[PDB]
Structure formats: structure tokens, C-alpha cells
Design a binder for these strands. Structure first.
Ligand code: K
Ligand code: K
Ligand code: K
Length: 49
RNA sequence: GUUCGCGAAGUAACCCUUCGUGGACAUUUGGUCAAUUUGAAACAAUACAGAGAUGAUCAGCAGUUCCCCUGCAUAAGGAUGAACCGUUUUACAAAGAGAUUU
């Protein structure tokens, strides 16, 4: 059963380290983007452009 | 300033001496640039993380780029120097059938 689980995991992978890091980096860049807009919106609502 | 010529004063008169006066000689430097904050050097420092093809550890050599750095360099080195990894819709037609409408 563990052999099958490990086989399914290794059979799934298709991208190397650089592409995988680019995926996580794009997700982090998006979360940073939304945090930036949240702070900017709070400031704007307070009349601070 | 010098020198050539002329007026004059001084001297008995020259030499010489002074005041005046004409000519000759010599003739336009330098800045793309002002002297600390506001016309632009960078490293470093603090933190986190710890290198592609892999199950794992790695040698690499390239290509593309409106990224270059070190080097005298057309050599070599810089993680295979780095970035590369995402997003993807129409030259759109033909034949036929069963339902919709006057
Ligand atoms: K490492
Ligand atoms: K390598
Ligand atoms: K190399």
C-alpha cells in the first residue's frame, strides 16, 4: 500500500525545481499584491491618498 | 620700455642731461568644467532562504534576451552567470437529420 502511494506520488511530478519555485513565488507575489491594495484602500478610506 | 627723427632748456660750443613731440618695435589668454546637501557610483549592514535536468548528489556546453559583471581579450570565469517554467479560442467551412417559426 505504501509502495503504491509512493508510486502515485512520483508518477505525478512533471516539473523541476525552478518551475515549482516559480509557482510558489507567483502565489506569494499575488498575496503581497493584495496586502498592498488592502493597506492602500484603508488609507484611501481615511482620506489619505 | 627700447630705439630712430624733430623742438626746447642747461653748457662758450660739442659730448652729455632733462621736459615736450612724431615714427618704429610688441597686439586679444581661458572655460563642454563655479566651491558640501537638491541631477544622481557602488558595496555593505539586519533578516530569511540555501544551486537546473533528480527518488538522490552532481560535471557540463549552448541558444534566445531592449540583464549584464570580472577580465588585455575574439580566451576563460561569473550557480550549466542570471532571466527562460506563465498565459493560451475565429483564414472556421461542408454534407445531412430531427425538432423550432410565417
Ligand atoms: K545547497
Ligand atoms: K552546474
Ligand atoms: K560556465
Amino acid at each position: 500500500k505504501e509502495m503504491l502511494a509512493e508510486a502515485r506520488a512520483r508518477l505525478l511530478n512533471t516539473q523541476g525545481k525552478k518551475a515549482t519555485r516559480k509557482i510558489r513565488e507567483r502565489m506569494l507575489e499575488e498575496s503581497k499584491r493584495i496586502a498592498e491594495l488592502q493597506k492602500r484602500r484603508e488609507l484611501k478610506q481615511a482620506g489619505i491618498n
